Each structure stands twice: as C-alpha cells, then as structure tokens.
Design a binder for this molecule. Sequence first.
Ligand SMILES: [Cl-]
Ligand code: NA
Length: 97
Amino acid sequence: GGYMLGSAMSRPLIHFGNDYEDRYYRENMYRYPNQVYYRPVDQYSNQNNFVHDCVNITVKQHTVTTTTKGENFTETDIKIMERVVEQMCITQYQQES
Ligand SMILES: [Cl-]
Ligand code: NA
C-alpha cells in the first residue's frame, strides 16, 4: 500500500435507467461505499483512466471487506455499486484536480 482515500460523502442521487435497479439502489443504499480508494490523481493525464482504476480498487476493497465479515453482495448490488463508485470517483477526480 497504499491507496489514497477520498473523504466520505453523501451517497449520490442517481436515476438508473433500469427501473428495478433504480428502486433497488434506494432500498439498499447503505450497502454501497460512501468513499473511494484510488491512486494519486497526478499519476493520471486522463479522467477516464483514473476513474477506471478508482472503480476497480474501490469495488475490490468493498467486496473484500464485506466477504470477510460473512456478508454478500447480489449481482444487482454489484451493478449498482459500480455506478455509484464511478460517480464518486468522477467527483474525486474533478475536486482533487
Ligand atoms: Cl449516504
Ligand atoms: Na434497506
């Protein structure tokens, strides 16, 4: 290690196109991260590359933390989590940049 953290934030409002995912995010919102892990922004020249890594690193950490407590994510959770983390990673790239 390590990775850099972002500050905890309010989990973002997201209008998912898939209606059932839209409702599922709201019902189960607290299952998802409210902060991101990443490699330093100044190691990237492009938002898209930063966000890709920020998503992979954050989802990895969150899934590992969850599995070792004996909890689980559904396939739906994973789809939503990736979107939520993407948004927070973008916010982190833009703020931090
Ligand atoms: Cl929240
Ligand atoms: Na709930």
